[PDB]
Amino acid sequence: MARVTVEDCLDKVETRFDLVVLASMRANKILKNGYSESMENEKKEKATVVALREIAESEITSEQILRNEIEG
Amino acid sequence: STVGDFIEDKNNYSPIEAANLENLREAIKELIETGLTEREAKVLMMRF
Amino acid sequence: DLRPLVPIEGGRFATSDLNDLYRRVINRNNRLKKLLDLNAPDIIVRNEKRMLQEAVDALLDNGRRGRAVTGSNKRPLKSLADMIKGKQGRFRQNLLGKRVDYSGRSVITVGPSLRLHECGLPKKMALELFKPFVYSKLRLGGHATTIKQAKRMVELEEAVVWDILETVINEHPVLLNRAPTLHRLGIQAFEPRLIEGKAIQLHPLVCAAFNADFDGDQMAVHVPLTVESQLEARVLMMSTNNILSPASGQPIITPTQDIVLGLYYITREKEGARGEGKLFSSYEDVSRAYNSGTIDIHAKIKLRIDRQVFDTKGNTYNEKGVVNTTVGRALLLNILPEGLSFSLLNKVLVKKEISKIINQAFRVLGGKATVVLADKLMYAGFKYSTLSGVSVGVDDMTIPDNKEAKIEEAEKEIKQITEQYQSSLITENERYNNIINIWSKTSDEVGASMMDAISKDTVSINGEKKEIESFNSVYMMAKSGARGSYNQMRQLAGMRGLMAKPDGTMIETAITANFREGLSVLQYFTSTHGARKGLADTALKTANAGYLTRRLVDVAQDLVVIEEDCGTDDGLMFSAIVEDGEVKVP
Amino acid sequence: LKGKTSDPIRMYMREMGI
Amino acid sequence: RMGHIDLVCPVVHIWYLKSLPSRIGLFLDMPLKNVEKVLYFESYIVTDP
Amino acid sequence: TEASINSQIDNLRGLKENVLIGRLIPAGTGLAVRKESAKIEKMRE
Amino acid sequence: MSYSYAEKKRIRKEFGVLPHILDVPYLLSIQTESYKKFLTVDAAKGRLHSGLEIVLKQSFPVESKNGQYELHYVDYQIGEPTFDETECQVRGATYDAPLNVKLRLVVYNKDALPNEKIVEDIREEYVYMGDIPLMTTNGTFIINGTERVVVSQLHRSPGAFFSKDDSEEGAFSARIIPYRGSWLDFEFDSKGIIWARIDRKRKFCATVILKALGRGRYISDTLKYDLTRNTDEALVEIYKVLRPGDPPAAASVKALFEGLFFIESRYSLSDIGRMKLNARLGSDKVSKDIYTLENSDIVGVIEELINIRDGKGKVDDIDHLGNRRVRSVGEMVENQFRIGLYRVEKGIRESMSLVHKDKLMPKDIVNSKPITAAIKEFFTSGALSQFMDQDNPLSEVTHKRRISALGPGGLSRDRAGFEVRDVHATHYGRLCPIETPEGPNIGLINSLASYARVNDYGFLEAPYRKVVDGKVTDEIEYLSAIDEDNYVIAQASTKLDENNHFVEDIIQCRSGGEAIFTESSRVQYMDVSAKQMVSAAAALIPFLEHDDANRVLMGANMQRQAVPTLKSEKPLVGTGMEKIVARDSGNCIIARNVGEVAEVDSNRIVIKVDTEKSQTSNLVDIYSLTKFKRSNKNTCINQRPIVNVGDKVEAGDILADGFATDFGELSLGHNLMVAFMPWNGYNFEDSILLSERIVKDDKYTSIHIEEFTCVARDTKLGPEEITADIPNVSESSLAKLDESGIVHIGANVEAGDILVAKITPKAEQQLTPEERLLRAIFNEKASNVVDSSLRMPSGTSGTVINVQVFENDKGGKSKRALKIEKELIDKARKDFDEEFAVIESVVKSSIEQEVVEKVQNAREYYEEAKIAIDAKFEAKKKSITQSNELSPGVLKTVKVFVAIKKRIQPGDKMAGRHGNKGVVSRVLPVEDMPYMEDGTPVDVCLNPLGIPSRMNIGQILEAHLGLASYGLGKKIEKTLEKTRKAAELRKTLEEVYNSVGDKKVNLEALNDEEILTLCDNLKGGVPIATPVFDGAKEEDIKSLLKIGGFATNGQMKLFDGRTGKPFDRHVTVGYMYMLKLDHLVDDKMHARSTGSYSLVTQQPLGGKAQFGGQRFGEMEVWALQAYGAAYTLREMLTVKSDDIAGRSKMYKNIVDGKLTMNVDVPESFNVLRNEVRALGIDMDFDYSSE
DNA sequence: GCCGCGTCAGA
DNA sequence: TCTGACGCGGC
Ligand SMILES: [Mg+2]
């Protein structure tokens, strides 16, 4: 547990299950966008945690997240 | 235990024996793509 | 290929029992057809037509009606139906079984330096479980181009391999599991970090959940692979989520064995000590002082504190002033996070209060506050539990002084009971029962004596001799709930007492000696009976509780909370469950 | 006699030596 | 990819006979041992009334 | 042998069946999915 | 106190008070003597007939069919083992002995008894019979070159047993238990009916048998209840029960019944059932010699049944040791012999119905196979013949004294409970009530008590001293298990007064089997010693009487998995019993005759014997040492000589102690100055802290001897080859290979190098187009062969010590084969020739020294030495030209031997003798451990919280005594670091030894050189012996501590190693002998990524032998359910185990590095739908719209 | 309409 | 061993 934890994220999204699915969708999106240009993943963290950080800092507002699936 | 759990599958391709193949099945499929304009490609495909 | 005939070593083959039953039904059918052809007499027609039915029934499931057929080795053959039933069958063996891949297992050791979400991992098992991830990262890294390349470069353990491995697992949690898995805390997720050696290390505060101790137990370790999985392990399965027990809200990560000894030790008091009654402004003052070596850590001092405190109703009022504390307790002032009142630390700190601290912390301050607090509590309890050098000699077990005469009275009364019997003046069973009570009560007395003989020590302190609570080792090991109980102390310093022959009917001779004094041959023999009985009774249970929990899991395996409200308005009537002598549950 | 005995060998020997 | 075997004379599926209660028995409304006798070539039974 | 007679149908509808056949069991994150994905329809429709 | 050679080297100060009545008998008697009764005779013991000949006696007069054919037994002769013990192991064979007997056949005209068989067939010969496996001197068998042990067996006795399954009243019963056959019974009812059954049956009234013979009321309560009428109705009714649906006959059942209980080869009681029934009924008027049942006997049975039904009698106890007996190997093999003889004689009565010969000889008749093919099978597959667990010399003795209740004729692991798993008051002197397993076996293994024995009938007796009118005599008898019920027996500590009269009046003793106080007037026996109650491996625990029982159980079960180490170190706190175990197991070399050392070196020992004080002898005998011989657990065995050139030794001394011994004392561990203080968490629960001086000094380091073996077969594509010629292999990986395909002897092989290089041919390529192209680019030819060599598995290392190679049969070997075999048998024969030559040189030196008569005395001993040299040089070629029958199909095989030292490391498992254990948790640098004020540091830091809760106090007292011994060591050192004289050293030694204790070692009996050996050997410490219940008491330990110059505690002041500031609260320290257990960490690590799969189910393997795959069993599924962790449960069941597509798919996704998952359906479910479809059931997927 | 005696199914 | 659910026969 480097910096951010579930106790943080649980304030915006709820039930701690929706968290899992929403973060998984977001991390999949961030993964398939070719973020793997390989000069960054050796200086920072896996997207699986990048998504959690993004949800904790309240940047994405998961109400928005789903609207990126219709962007699929 | 019993003998009936020491016999193992021997006539298949373990997921490693079948991963060192596509790494070659696709390799030459690109190697040739830096050769002839088109001709020798057609010829090697047809003749092999 | 579901009943193979594969050849194996020794130039031999391994048929399946089904091949034989098939090879029998077939040629019996064949002979039957040949007979029907040749127009044989009806007797042998009957015999064939019956032999055929027998072989068919054997093939389906032999043993339903007869004396099921056997092969040369004389085993009852494994018929068709006998493959999809029984614990070794097909349903609960390979459909809920599935020896999986990406796994390993080794011996556990302690590692008291980690944090509550980490675990040691021998670099060998790490190299093995993550191998394909390593391959991918090498290929993409441009240090190998084929797969045979990477496989040939990992076989020889290049130096870059270790670096790339370490960066692979930066935040890739694993699972850990201990074999008899009784409750969901039997499986939790940690974050590895490379270690040398060949044994898993795990934070001690969790060895209560896994119900583990380090006399040889071995743990398994599985890896998650996907993006959903290795995020589900992070959010729903990491040790920092499992503080309270699902069975009951009580916490599960409280300090246990000698983390409690050190705390209880440095949180006591002493009357005449050095530096007594001094004055200190803040914690750093007490630290500077105590490291200088003038004060005794059990001294009474006065500290002036000032910090916020959270009220029940979400308030947060300020608290200040001067409080009469002890040099020891102030040393714990640093770890208490801002938000809790000092009134928690300002006592003697036996286990039942450490748990209180942790519960209180969780319910008001959060969840992360609690894991950090338990971190510091362990980090400190370990420190001060070795600067105190607690140990155990044999003179720390003190036999009470009035033992011989307290035994003499009892044996004299016994002679008197034997007298009342010998002249037929009293019956037998009543003599037996009263002898039992005699020995029981006297043993109780001699046991209760050593409590005062070991928990009190008088000393002619300046002015006079007054009794004070002892600093004995074996008394502290059990007045702090660390490890022990009054009964063991009894059997060490007092006397064993009554040993029940296999049934439970007590023996009419009690054991007068004790372990510090040793026993005679007969006295040991009398005890081995109950020893073996109680030892055997566990092994002949270990399968029963599992049986009952299996049944129960079946009964209710499909109860899921699915909807917010069911709308109804009917329930039950609850009331404190009196038992004519007490409430026993409010 | 015809007394529920299952194993066929007897049910054949009986009639056999009749 | 299964196969099959041709049976000259029909043969009773053991399960539906010795499963307690015997579905064959419950159907024909007869006690089992009476059936097994017929099956074991120990009697006859009127098929044509 | 009893269910064989009645031509018994068995809707999966449970926890110890989606495991015999490898499906997201109808609990835990399974219902979370069946909720969130269902909430996509009402948008893309 | 020396009185002997070894103790003279390092005396063991002793404690206790009690005098030594009777030495402990030979340990392995139960296992050895149970064989001489079966193979030999002695008239003194009354054993006139070797049981083998007795079993032969009961078969041979058969006289097949009136053909004037007689069959009579005459004699028997046992051959000689073609290979002795140490050879039938190396060759891979079975120590064997052929059996041959003598038969006479006689005939005449053979008309209608017209001098039928009187005139002909005057000849006889010694027909071959079979093979008999002999046992070595120590009670083991070498079966296919694998030392095996046949544990004894405990089983119910044959006789009459009355009980009452009291879920009723008066529900009595009876049993007539036969030695072999079918067992009757006679049960009652609620009303009083006497039923009867034969081992299982319809419950027919007991009067049926009485008809089958033809206040006493119950007969009338029964006679009028059965409809049977007369004699034959009884038999025709019984015959229905035995064979239902079988139409009876006239002259058939008359054979059935009278063969059910009345055929001497169908039912018997064998001298025991007869005696136990006679004494039960008193009726001597029945011949105690005929073992078949009898009518008088059965009416006695029923009479006693109703008699007890009245109230005049007593039911029996099925667990009382007088009703269960021991049956060792020498009886099991006899039984198998009996079965084989049955078979062969049944075949004999038919090998006469093919007469075609003239003057038939009595040899063509006899057959052999069904005898050996039964004996051998019992020896090679029985449940009661397992590998000898060969951890260390205690393991051997324990396994040889074990006494199971499982196997043919006994119980089962789940067909018993709560009764046969308890200590009956009769267990006392017979089975140790502390030493058992701990799994599901607890209570069925019951190692044997030390002084125990076995009477001629198989009951376990025990010794005792009589008393005669209040004065304890010194006679000793062996009181049985039953007579003991009646007397009253004291215990070995109750003191006496100068005339053996009980000083106390009211004492403790066992009167009615149970314990009670009573008065000295009513006692009849006192025990022979104190350790009489406990096993031979419990007696190795100092201060046993200050410990619990659940804890001592583990303390005993553990110290027999202890692993021996490099340099044996005697315990410093023993019990004077390690002198006995090791001596009483054939790991040491006890001198046969008294003499002087001739010439000793680390391969053999030579002893010339002064014949003046010894019986007729040979003036020289030899002992051959055993260096680095393997053992079942891969542990190194080697003896090391003790003696020096020219030393006086005696008969019964230690020449060269061997396996895990030291000066003749069983030593399994080391001694570690150990503290007791929680250090920093690094000994939190039960962990242990070590000190890195232990490691650097080779303290806990073992030698494990692995052994691989490769074989070459003849497959249907051709012969495979082990030649060092395989393409795709450089000369670098081949560099360590010799010119023959086999590794050198000395090359330190690595983790994954070639040991023997092999190749096997293949075919059917039809290679892929791309493989075709790439062959066609580099001109890459496709080789038809593939190599399958032999390589050390990963994670191992070491070197090579022996390379056995076995060639082919019936084929003239080539140069590097035939010449090499001749050269090897030569390096055997010429070297042994120099060996026997040095032996003859010694004999000739002793003869020329004694020339002043060798003219005739030993003019033939060398004639016998050369005879055996030739016997061995021929047996070195009397093999099958390839050393074995080769199990046809096998061309060549090779054995490889690899050895590797191992040092202790975080993860191993140590355990003291007192039931405490733990896992080594870390290793700290020298300067970190706490250290006494002097400067010496402390090795181990155990944890104090353990001891009180689990009351294994005795460990503490062991640490106190150890500290004392270590003080006494430093004292002698100080006195010896100056003035290496002898007289004043006798003074300081008197001070150390005779100060405390009443034993007075009498140090006057040593010279000024032996004292300088002793004081030298005593520098490390002074050994102490505290017997098991005669122990040394606290104040003695304390006086010793004072003498040493320490506190009258164990406690002392310590200093941290990271600061120097002392700890408060003085800490305990001591010595505390410690062991390492055979649960190393090198063989439990076992990770796995991807490997083979199961044939019938497509799932990973399991066990770390192949490649494992950790069981994710059923209970771990509920866990992931409760979490609601759907995903991680799903792909834990398809992608990881048995989704054929998904496996490769995911393993591809990883190496590439994208995201995707496909989870269609597992394979085991398709297998299930098949298996159910292979019945008339149609399971199938479908769709639904309603 | 029931007092005893079976088989089967899990330990 | 048992513990019972479930029998299916003597009366
Ligand atoms: Mg454990």
TrEMBL record, chain D:
Lineage: Bacteria, Pseudomonadati, Pseudomonadota, Gammaproteobacteria, Thiotrichales
Subcellular location: Cytoplasm
Gene that encodes the chain: rpoD
Organism: Francisella tularensis subsp. holarctica
Role played: Sigma factors are initiation factors that promote the attachment of RNA polymerase to specific initiation sites and are then released. This sigma factor is the primary sigma factor during exponential growth.
The protein's assembly and partners: Interacts transiently with the RNA polymerase catalytic core.
Shown chain mapped onto the complete sequence: 80 to 97 of 577
Protein name from the UniProt record: RNA polymerase sigma factor RpoD
Highest taxon, organism lineage: Bacteria
Family to which this protein belongs: Belongs to the sigma-70 factor family. RpoD/SigA subfamily.
